[PDB]
Amino acid sequence: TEFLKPRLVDIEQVSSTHAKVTLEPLERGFGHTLGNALRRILLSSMPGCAVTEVEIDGVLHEYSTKEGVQEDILEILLNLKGLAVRVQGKDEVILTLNKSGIGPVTAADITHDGDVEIVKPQHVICHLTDENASISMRIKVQRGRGYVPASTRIHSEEDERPIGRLLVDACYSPVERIAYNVEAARVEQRTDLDKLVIEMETNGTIDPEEAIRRAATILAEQLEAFVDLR
Amino acid sequence: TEFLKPRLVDIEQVSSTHAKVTLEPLERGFGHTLGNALRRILLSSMPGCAVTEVEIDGVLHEYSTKEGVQEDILEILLNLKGLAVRVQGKDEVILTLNKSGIGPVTAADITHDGDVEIVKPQHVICHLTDENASISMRIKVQRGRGYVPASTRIHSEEDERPIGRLLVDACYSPVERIAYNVEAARVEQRTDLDKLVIEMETNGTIDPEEAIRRAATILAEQLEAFVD
Amino acid sequence: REEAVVWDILDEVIREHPVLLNRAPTLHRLGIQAFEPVLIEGKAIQLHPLV
Amino acid sequence: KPLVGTGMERAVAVDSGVTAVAKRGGVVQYVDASRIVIKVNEDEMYPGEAGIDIYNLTKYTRSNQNTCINQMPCVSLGEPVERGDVLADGPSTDLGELALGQNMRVAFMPWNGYNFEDSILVSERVVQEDRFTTIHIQELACVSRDTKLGPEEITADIPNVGEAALSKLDESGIVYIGAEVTGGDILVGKVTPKGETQLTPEEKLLRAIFGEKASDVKDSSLRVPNGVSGTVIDVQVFTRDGVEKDKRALEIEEMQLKQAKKDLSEELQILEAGLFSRIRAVLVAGGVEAEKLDKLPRD
Amino acid sequence: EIKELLKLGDLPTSGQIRLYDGRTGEQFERPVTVGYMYMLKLNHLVDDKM
Amino acid sequence: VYSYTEKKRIRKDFGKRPQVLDVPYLLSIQLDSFQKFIEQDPEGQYGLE
Amino acid sequence: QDVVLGLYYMTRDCVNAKGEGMVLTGPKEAERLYRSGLASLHARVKVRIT
C-alpha cells in the first residue's frame, strides 16, 4: 500500500477577487473526489461578513424615503448587502456612516474604525443630491456562514428590536464563484500523479490561502465522526 | 462559528457482507459531499488481493476445453476472479489446485498453505464429470488497489508473459457495491438537515464497518498537509 | 403560541394515520386515494409521481 | 429588462402611461426620489408662464391586485434630455423598456424527478439575489360602527389581552408607524357593547370565589390575517363629523397639514425660481446690469 | 444569424454545453441546452392558495 | 442618430422590413371616445349635444 | 415521462463505446464499472446471471 500525501503548492493571485490555487501531488482519482467536497463546503460554509441591521435617521421603515436621497431605502439596503467587510477581533461591529453635502457616498466616507477593513472603499451606497442633504446611520455588520434572511432571524427573535431598526437579509457567503480543474501535474519522473487547480472568485472578504485551510479543516472535522465511532 | 457534528446511529448488518449504516444528523449539502467522497475512494482506490494469473496443465490458451470439465475455461476463469483470498504477510503468492474424479470442485481442494486463508471454502469452481478427468493448476494472487481488468494490464505490459499463462481480470476492490440515499433528516426545529443512508456490499474478507474507517483514513491522511 | 412540543404531538397522531387526497373532477374512484402523510415545511402538498 | 424583446417593449411602456415622460425637454435641475424638476430649453418655453416643469413621482402605492406600484427616477441631475425621454420608470419598466420579469440561466434537462411534469427546479441563488420577491401592499379596514347596544369605540383598552399585543399600540389604540407584525397580532383596538347575565349555575360559583369582575366588551379589535406577515407602510384615519377627534387622528391630520404647507411652499418657490431666472435673461439682453441686480433683493 | 452570434459569444453554436453535476462531480454524458430565458412570477401565490 | 435614452441603451433589432407607419397610440379608443361624449361642439352631434 | 426516459437510456445499446466485450461475474460489477467510468451503460456485455 502506497498512500500519497498531497501538499499545498501554488497560490497565485491574479486579482484581489480572483485566486488560483494548485494542489499537488494528488493521487489518481482523488482529483474529482476532493474537487467536489471542496467546492460544496467552500461556498456554503465559508464564513463571511454581511450587513445585518440598520438604523437610518428619519427612516421608520424600508419602504419610505428621505428627501434629497436618490436611492429608495430598500435599494440602499441592497447596496449595503454588497459591501465587502473584513473584521479582525470582534464578531459584530457597528459602522457609522455620516456624509454631508452634494456627492456620492462611498465606503471611504464611513468613519474608519480600527478593527475594521473596508474591502471595497469605492463602493457606492447612496447619492446625496441636495446641498443641505445630510445622511446619517448606524449599520450593523456581522460575521456569518451562508445565508440567513431577515425572516429566519425574526422567527426565533426574542432579541426585541427598537422601532426604526431595520433588519437586513444577510448574504454572508463571501464566495461568489468557484470551480476546479483536474489536470495531470509535473512530476519529474512519475507519470500518474496530478494537480488540482482551483479557480476561485470572492468578494475580497476571505483570503485565498485562509479559505483553503479552513475549508479542508471543517471537512476533516466532519470526517472525525466516521473514523471515531467504529 | 458553529459546526454540525454527526454520529453513528444504525448499523443494519443484515449480512456480514452487506451492511447498511444510517447516519444522522447531516448538515445540508454534506449528504452528497460526503456521500460522494466516500463512494469514489471506496471503489477505485481500496487495496485488496485477487487472482491475477493462472496456469492449468493441459490448458495453454483460455478458449480451449479441458478433458472432462463441463465448464469452458472462460466460465471457470470468471468463477475464480470472484474467489475471496486472505493472505497475511506475503504480497504475491501462488496457490496450487489438485482435484480429481467425479464431482464438484470447491475451494477446499486448494493446497492449505499456512499463511493463506480461503474465505469461501465452498466457492464453486468446476464440475468434473468423468472420474478419469483430472484438474491441476497454479493460480496466482497479488495484492493491489482498485480494479484492473485484463485489457488494461495488456496496456502497461512491457512485462512479457509466457505461454499457458492465462491472465484474468483482477478484482482487488473488496467493496462490491456502494451507494448512499439522502433521505430527509429534519432534526427537531431545523428541517434543512438530512440523513445519510450508506448501503454497502463488501467482499466478505473485510467487514463493511472497517471499510468505512479505511476510506476516511486514506482521505484524512491527504488532508494532513492542509490542516497544517 | 406554537412551541416545539406541539409539533411532536402532531407527529404522534399523524403516525399511522391515513389521510385522503382528492382531485376534482372525481373521474373515477381513484380520484381519491389514501396516504400516510409526512409533515414538511412550506405550504405546498407533496404528491407521489406514480399516482 | 428582457434579453429577448421585439422593439415593441418601448412602445408598450410608453403607452401604459404609468411611467413619467418629459413633455418639453431641457436639462434636469433637481433630482429626488420623490421630485424630478426640469429646466426647459427656451425652445419649448412659453413666453407666458415660467419654464420649469415639475414631476412629483409616486412611490409604493397599492394596486387593485394588492401589487406594487412604485416609480424609480432614471436619469441624473444635470442631464440634458429630449422631449419624450423616460424620466421615471413605472414598476415593471426599465430605461424605456418593458421589464416584465427577470432572466435566468436555464438548463433543459431531467432531474431526479424534481422537474417531473412541467415542475420547476430552482436555485437558492434566486433568493440570495432577492429576485422574484414581491412587494404586496395589502389593505385592511377597521370599522367602528354604532349598534343600539351602544356606540363602539377605538381605544388601547383591551380586556384579557397579552401586553405583547398592547405594547405596539399608541394611547389611541393604533399600531405604530413602521412596526413589523404577524398574522393574529392586533393592529387596531376596538370595543363593542356586550351583555351577559347567562350565568349557568357553575359559572356563578367561580365568579364569586376568585372575583375577576366581568367587564362587558367584545374583542372587536382589528386582527391581522392568517399566516401573513409584513410591515405597516402607512395608516389612514377618517373620523365622522359627529363624534370628536381621536388623539391619533388629530396628530396624523396635523402631520398631513404641515405636509401640504411644505409641499406648496416648495411648489411656489420652484416655479418662482424659474420666473426670476427668466427675468434676468430678459433684463441682461438689452440692459447690461449684473453688479446692481444680483445683490438687490428679489421681490 | 443566431448561430453566427454564438460564435461572437465564443460559445457552442448548437447552444449546448457539457455540465458537471455539483453533487457527484460526474459529468452528464452529453451536452445540454443552457442559456438565458425570461421568467415571470405570477399573481398566483401559494401564500393565498394555502 | 438617436435620443439620449437610446444612446444610453440600444436594443439590436433583427427586423427585415422597415416599419413605415409608427405604432399608433394604443389607448386612443378610450381617450378619443370619452372625449366625444363631453366635447363642446355645438353643431357636431356627439354625446350631450 | 422521465421514468420511462431513464429506463430507456439504460436499456438502449450502443456500438463499442467503452468496455465492449467485457465478461462480468454478476450484476454488481456492471454498476461498479459505470461508476468508475470504465464502461458506458450502453455497452454490450456478457454477464453471468442466475
Swiss-Prot record, chain A:
Q: Which reaction does it catalyse?
A: RNA(n) + a ribonucleoside 5'-triphosphate = RNA(n+1) + diphosphate
Q: Which domain of life does the UniProt lineage start with?
A: Bacteria
Keyword Nucleotidyltransferase present in the record's keywords: the answer is: yes
Give GO terms for biological process. DNA-templated transcription
Q: Tell me its EC number(s), please.
A: 2.7.7.6
Q: What class of enzyme is it?
A: transferase
Any one cellular component term from GO for this entry? DNA-directed RNA polymerase complex
The answer to whether UniProt assigns keyword Transmembrane helix to this entry is no
Q: Could you describe the subunit structure of this protein?
A: Homodimer. The RNAP catalytic core consists of 2 alpha, 1 beta, 1 beta' and 1 omega subunit. When a sigma factor is associated with the core the holoenzyme is formed, which can initiate transcription.
Q: What note about domains is in the entry?
A: The N-terminal domain is essential for RNAP assembly and basal transcription, whereas the C-terminal domain is involved in interaction with transcriptional regulators and with upstream promoter elements.
Tell me what this protein is called. DNA-directed RNA polymerase subunit alpha
Q: What species is this protein from?
A: Escherichia coli O139:H28 (strain E24377A / ETEC)
List the top taxonomic levels of the source: Bacteria, Pseudomonadati, Pseudomonadota, Gammaproteobacteria, Enterobacterales
Curated annotation (Swiss-Prot), chain F:
**Domain of life here?**
Bacteria
Query: Which family does the UniProt entry place this protein in?
Result: Belongs to the RNA polymerase beta chain family.
Could you give the subunit structure recorded for this chain?
The RNAP catalytic core consists of 2 alpha, 1 beta, 1 beta' and 1 omega subunit. When a sigma factor is associated with the core the holoenzyme is formed, which can initiate transcription.
Described function? DNA-dependent RNA polymerase catalyzes the transcription of DNA into RNA using the four ribonucleoside triphosphates as substrates.
- Specify the protein name: DNA-directed RNA polymerase subunit beta
To which species is this protein native? Escherichia coli O139:H28 (strain E24377A / ETEC)
The top of its lineage is: Bacteria, Pseudomonadati, Pseudomonadota, Gammaproteobacteria, Enterobacterales
Its gene name is rpoB
UniProtKB/Swiss-Prot annotation, chain G:
Q: Could you tell me which cysteines form disulfide bridges? A: none
The signal peptide annotation in the UniProt record is none
| Subunit and partners | The RNAP catalytic core consists of 2 alpha, 1 beta, 1 beta' and 1 omega subunit. When a sigma factor is associated with the core the holoenzyme is formed, which can initiate transcription.
Q: Which family does it belong to?
A: Belongs to the RNA polymerase beta' chain family.
Q: What does this protein do?
A: DNA-dependent RNA polymerase catalyzes the transcription of DNA into RNA using the four ribonucleoside triphosphates as substrates.
The protein in question is named DNA-directed RNA polymerase subunit beta'
What gene name does this entry carry? Answer: rpoC
